[PDB]
């Protein structure tokens, strides 16, 4: 393989998904230049688990997945193995045995708008925790008591999603961060993604 992996499409994407509806790009049959990502001085977070970040260009994997979404600054710590909280429990969950890297950068200049950017959403209500790499896009009214809701937002009956409302004057912890999660999968199948 001589074609480069389309990591540009993921990291430089025009728009990013809401975390509850996180995007997944399946990357295969390509050569990846991972040192380009790690040599970049433009990332706030670059944490890898089960792989050393530098000595990564001479590894081959069956599939590489690139998940991407926007969360709060204060919530980036939840995109890690073994974490709990609103985002890890109800929006995007990494497995305990995660093999991959978590990459984040402040996107206040792109994803906040004056008076509030209500495009980006997170799930506030869910009965049970997500399994690793589970994506829940349902919009059913959340039942917090014994009586059914049937589509109306009232007492004990909550719309499950809420808006971040990113305003450019937000404190850093409330500012938007774009996140890319690279997971590396090694199955008993031909390895389609190698580095060079």
């Amino acid at each position, epitope marked *: 393989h001589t074609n480069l992996c389309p990591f540009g499409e993921v990291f430089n994407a025009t728009r990013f998904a809401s975390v509850y509806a996180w995007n997944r790009k399946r990357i295969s049959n390509c050569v990846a230049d991972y040192s380009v990502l790690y040599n970049s001085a433009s990332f706030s977070t670059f944490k890898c688990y089960g792989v050393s970040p530098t000595k990564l260009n001479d590894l081959c994997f069956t599939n590489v997945y690139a998940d991407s979404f926007v969360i709060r600054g204060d919530e980036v710590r939840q995109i890690a193995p073994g974490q709990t909280g*609103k985002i890890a429990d109800y929006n995007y969950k990494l497995p305990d045995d995660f093999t991959g890297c978590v990459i984040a950068w402040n996107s206040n200049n792109l994803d906040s708008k004056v008076g509030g950017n209500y495009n980006y959403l997170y799930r506030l209500f869910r009965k049970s925790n997500l399994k690793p790499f589970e994506r829940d896009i349902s919009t059913e009214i959340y039942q917090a008591g014994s009586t059914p809701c049937n589509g109306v937002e009232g007492f004990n009956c909550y719309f499950p999603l809420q808006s971040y409302g990113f305003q450019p004057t937000n*404190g850093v912890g409330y500012q938007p961060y774009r996140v890319v999660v690279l997971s590396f999968e090694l199955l008993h199948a031909p390895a389609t993604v190698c580095g060079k």
Partner: antibody, heavy 117, light 109 residues
Framework: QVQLVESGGGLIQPGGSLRLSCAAS????????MSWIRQAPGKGLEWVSV???????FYADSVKGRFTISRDNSKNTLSLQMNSLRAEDTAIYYC???????????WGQGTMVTVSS | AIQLTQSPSFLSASIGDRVTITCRAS??????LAWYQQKPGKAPKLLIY???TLQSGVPSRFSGSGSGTEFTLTISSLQPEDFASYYC??????????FGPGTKVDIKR
């Protein structure tokens, strides 16, 4: 008839233990963000602990390792186990339901906890 | 972490007065604020959440406003049951909820 009712407070020596309970009606404890909040005499509110519907629990730094929040689904109750109590834990303890990012709409009447030698 | 101030700490008012209480956040917190009322010996009572949404069952004379760092609670026409203390709360806060130091509204004479 929505209400929360705390119980189990009382007078205890430093180092002792108390277990608070909170009986809910009109909301399901294990489907809500349920918190304990306390208020020392003459002071303001201090959040103590929360349990998420999905089961995650979190604690104020000042009580971490000493208090444990739990719930009983069959009795629709919430509990707070308080070990290694200190004089500064003296407060009225409220249970409350969090319906939006910390907005507590339903409060119990509170139960008084007094820690003193 | 973010800190909340409240102004003024004490306010004297008469029945029928327009009353405005202010809460300041040390950094921008958008509309992540709630307001409570509390009287001696009683649990707090939620008045406003999301900076401006009136909690159901709260009289319409209560309103909140502001976004970012400056927030106000307004009582358009003060009623006898409104003499009380009032607290703001930073919502969706890390690592823990933060409460303002309060405003006590007493009876002017």
């Amino acid at each position: 008839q929505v209400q929360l009712v705390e119980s189990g407070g009382g007078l205890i020596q430093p180092g002792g233990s108390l277990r608070l309970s909170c009986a809910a009606s009109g909301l399901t404890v294990n489907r809500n963000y349920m918190s304990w909040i306390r208020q020392a005499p003459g002071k303001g509110l201090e959040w103590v602990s929360v349990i998420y519907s999905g089961g995650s629990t979190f604690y104020a730094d000042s009580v971490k390792g000493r208090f444990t929040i739990s719930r009983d689904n069959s009795k629709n109750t919430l509990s707070l186990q308080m070990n290694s109590l200190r004089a500064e834990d003296t407060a009225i303890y409220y249970c409350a339901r969090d319906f939006y990012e910390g907005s507590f709409d339903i409060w119990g009447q509170g139960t008084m906890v007094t820690v003193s030698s | 972490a973010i800190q909340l101030t409240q102004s003024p700490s004490f306010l004297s008012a008469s029945i029928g007065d327009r009353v405005t209480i202010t809460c300041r956040a040390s950094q921008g917190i958008s509309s992540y604020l709630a307001w409570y009322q509390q009287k001696p010996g009683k649990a707090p009572k939620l008045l406003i959440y999301a900076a401006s949404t009136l909690q159901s069952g709260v009289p319409s004379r209560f309103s909140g406003s502001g976004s970012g760092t400056e927030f106000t609670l307004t009582i358009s026409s003060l009623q006898p049951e409104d003499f009380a203390s009032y607290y703001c709360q930073q919502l969706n806060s890390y690592p823990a909820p933060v409460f303002g130091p309060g405003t006590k509204v007493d009876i002017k004479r």
